[PDB]
Amino acid sequence: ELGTSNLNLDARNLLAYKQTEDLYHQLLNYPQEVISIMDQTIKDCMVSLIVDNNLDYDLDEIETKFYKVRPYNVGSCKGMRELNPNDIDKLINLKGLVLRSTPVIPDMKVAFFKCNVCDHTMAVEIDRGVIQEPARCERIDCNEPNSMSLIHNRCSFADKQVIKLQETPDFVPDGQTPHSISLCVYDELVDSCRAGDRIEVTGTFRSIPIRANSRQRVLKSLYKTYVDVVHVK
């Protein structure tokens, strides 16, 4: 009715149902795949409601939307000092104070390529941030190799933002400098919390390699940790 897409899910409700206790455990253990499955299922039920109820609502509008799920209340909140490597790629809850938020960063989703010889265009999806540029024109008649140009302004982008979070005052055991963690928010969650605001964030604890230098594929041994936020309160 309101035209929104994001759905807020209480993880405890999964435990409240006999069938989905395993699903709750999997979400706690394997969040990425479970979240993707949940998004697709949400879209499927949304379309099926209109299909079964033979409502007058337009279906084409629904088919062209992106749907998401924002789970919260996934257990007791840990501390920034209690995050060990065992918690990598797992769903965590963290309370803290917002300290700064970078401006909106455009994140690429779909790459748009153009042929230099026949003015033919094609869109290639991006996986793990790797553009799958064609080797040659897809046209039978025009098979010109190595003639594809990327049009930056005709591509599809997403919203990204990096936020610095500090542990709450009560979490400091003795009174030393409070520790901080970096958060990443995408799409609607962008601009969902200003500096100096106390928030609770649910997300995935992730580690990403850091390149030694800009010239080479060489990586640092030490990994950097951050949180892929899925819900903000």
Partner 1 sequence: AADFSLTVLRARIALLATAIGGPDYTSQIDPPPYKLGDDCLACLKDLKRWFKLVDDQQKRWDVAMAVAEYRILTDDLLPILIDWENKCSLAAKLAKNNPDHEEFRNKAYYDKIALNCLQLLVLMTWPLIVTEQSSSNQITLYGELKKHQLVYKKTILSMESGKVLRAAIRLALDVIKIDRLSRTPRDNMVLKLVLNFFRNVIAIEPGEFTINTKKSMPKKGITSIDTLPPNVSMDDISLNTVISSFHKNKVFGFLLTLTSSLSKEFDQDFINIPLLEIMFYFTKDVNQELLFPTSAGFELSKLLQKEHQMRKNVIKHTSARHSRFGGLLSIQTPDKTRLTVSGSQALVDEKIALQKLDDSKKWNKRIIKKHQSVAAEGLPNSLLNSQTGKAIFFTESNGKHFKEFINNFIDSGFNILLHSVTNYFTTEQDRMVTLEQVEYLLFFAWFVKYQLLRSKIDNSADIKQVSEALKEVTFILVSSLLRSAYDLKNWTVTHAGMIAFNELLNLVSRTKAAQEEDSTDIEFIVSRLFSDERIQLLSNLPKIGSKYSLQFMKSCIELTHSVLKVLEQYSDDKTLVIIEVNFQKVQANYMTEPVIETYINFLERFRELEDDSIKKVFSFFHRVFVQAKEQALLFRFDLIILLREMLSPDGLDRMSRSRKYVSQFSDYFLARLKKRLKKSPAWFVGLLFPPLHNSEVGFYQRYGE
Partner 2 sequence: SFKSRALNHVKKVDDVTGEKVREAFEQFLEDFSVVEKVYRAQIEFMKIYDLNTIYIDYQHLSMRENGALAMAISEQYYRFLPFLQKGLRRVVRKYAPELLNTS
Partner DNA sequence: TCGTGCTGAGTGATATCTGCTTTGGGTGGGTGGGTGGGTTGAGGCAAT
Partner DNA sequence: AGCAGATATCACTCAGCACGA
The length of the chain in residues reads 233
H or E stretch at 28: helix 21-29
What's the CA angle centered on 203, arms 202 and 209, to 5 degrees? 155
The tokens for 82 are 């209690």
User: Shortest approach of DNA to residue 106 CB, angstroms?
Assistant: 19
Q: Which amino acid is at 54?
A: N
Q: Which of 86, 153, 176, 214 binds DNA (CB under 7 A)?
A: 214
Q: Does 221 bind DNA (CB under 7 A)?
A: no
Rounded CA separation 100/227 (Å): 15
Nearer to partner 1, 13 or 41 (CB): 41
Q: Which is nearer to partner 2, 75 or 106 (CB)?
A: 106
Which part of the chain contacts Zn ion (CB under 5 A), choosing from 57-65, 140-148, 165-173, 212-220? 140-148
Shortest separation between residue 230's beta carbon and DNA, angstroms? 33
Q: Which residues make up the interface to partner 2 (CB under 8 A)?
A: 117-120, 141-142, 153-154
**C-alpha neighbours within 13 Å on the C-beta side of residue 68:** 13
Closest distance of CB 129 from DNA, Å: 17
Residue 181, classed as helix, strand or coil, is strand
Residues that bind DNA (CB under 7 A): 145, 213-218
